[PDB]
Scaffold this active site. Structure first.
Site, PDB file in Angstrom:
ATOM      1  N   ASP A 134      -9.223  -4.684  -5.191  1.00 23.69           N
ATOM      2  CA  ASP A 134      -8.710  -3.686  -4.259  1.00 23.69           C
ATOM      3  C   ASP A 134      -9.583  -2.436  -4.305  1.00 23.69           C
ATOM      4  OD1 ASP A 134      -7.176  -1.950  -2.673  1.00 23.69           O
ATOM      5  OD2 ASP A 134      -5.304  -2.888  -3.320  1.00 23.69           O
ATOM      6  N   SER A 144       0.858  -1.192   0.000  1.00 23.68           N
ATOM      7  CA  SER A 144       0.000   0.000   0.000  1.00 23.68           C
ATOM      8  C   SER A 144       0.890   1.236   0.000  1.00 23.68           C
ATOM      9  CB  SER A 144      -0.978  -0.103   1.162  1.00 23.68           C
ATOM     10  OG  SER A 144      -2.155   0.633   0.890  1.00 23.68           O
ATOM     11  N   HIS A 159      -7.424  -5.843  -0.783  1.00 22.14           N
ATOM     12  CA  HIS A 159      -6.244  -5.002  -0.499  1.00 22.14           C
ATOM     13  C   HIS A 159      -5.323  -5.675   0.522  1.00 22.14           C
ATOM     14  CE1 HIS A 159      -3.852  -1.466  -0.099  1.00 22.14           C
ATOM     15  NE2 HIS A 159      -4.023  -1.484   1.217  1.00 22.14           N
TER      16      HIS A 159
END
Length: 257
Positions: free
Chosen positions: A175, A129, A207
């Protein structure tokens, strides 16, 4: 190739939870860490083959080491020195995460238990991320880095045409935090068309797929680090052409490398 470590690869070998190399680990405290929030360094005990490449991995927003810890030994047991880092503050943004990855890598140069086991010239960055956006800015600010692997990366910066480091963009199909259309794929598209690069999309993935052991993530991160931190041509077979993999929803690359 003098950087080749370990036997010839198979699908089982890159998919294994542990490679041939036995691994140990040191911790860098928050105080001992110049430019980052500390971390854990996983390294191979066998020095009889030579020094190993180095990898730094950053977690995401408000996340710590435990979100990415399983990547450390899994990757190190293939023949790498891997530091999973904590950030200086939990709210550090992607651009800051890139420096903390660079300072974690730099810290490896001087680490007592590790510096003799490292080839300081062959280093790589990874991240989940905002830590993936971390990995990209670290490469965009260090053209000597050998590999960069953003895992469901998040970044307000969409243009990465300055990256000169071979980059594997691992996106999650489902995601919603860092959707691949405006993040991962946009990163891949804006990487130089001449770069050694590849986009890989995990089918049906959220995610958070990188926060638990995911065999697809590990096996192709290993191939990418082997292919580009070790110049190990034995691992190109897994990258070129597109993996024959059901866990992979989409795939584009600049094969052959």
């Amino acid at each position: 190739n003098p950087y080749e470590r370990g036997p010839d690869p198979t699908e089982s070998s890159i998919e294994a939870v542990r490679g041939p190399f036995a691994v140990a680990q040191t911790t860098v405290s928050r105080l001992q860490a110049d430019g980052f929030g500390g971390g854990t360094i996983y390294y191979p005990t066998d020095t009889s083959q030579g020094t190993f490449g180095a990898v730094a991995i950053s977690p995401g927003f408000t996340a710590g080491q435990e979100s990415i810890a399983w990547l450390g030994p899994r990757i190190a047991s293939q023949g790498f020195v891997v530091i999973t880092i904590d950030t200086i503050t939990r709210l550090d943004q992607p651009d800051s995460r890139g420096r903390q990855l660079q300072a974690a890598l730099d810290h490896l140069r001087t680490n007592s238990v590790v510096r003799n086991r490292i080839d300081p010239n062959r280093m790589a960055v990874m991240g989940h991320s905002m830590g993936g956006g971390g990995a990209l800015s670290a490469a965009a600010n260090n053209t000597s880095l050998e590999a960069a692997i953003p895992l469901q990366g998040w970044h307000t910066r969409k243009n990465w045409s300055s990256v000169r480091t071979p980059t594997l963009v691992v996106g999650a199909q489902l995601d919603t935090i860092a959707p691949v259309s405006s993040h991962s794929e946009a990163f891949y598209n804006s990487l130089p068309s001449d770069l050694d690069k590849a986009y890989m999309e995990l089918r049906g993935a959220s995610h958070l797929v990188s926060n638990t052991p995911d065999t697809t993530t590990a096996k192709y991160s290993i191939a990418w680090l082997k292919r580009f931190v070790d110049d190990d041509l034995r691992y190109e077979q897994f990258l070129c052409p597109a993996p024959d993999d059901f866990a992979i929803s989409e795939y584009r690359s600049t094969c052959p490398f």
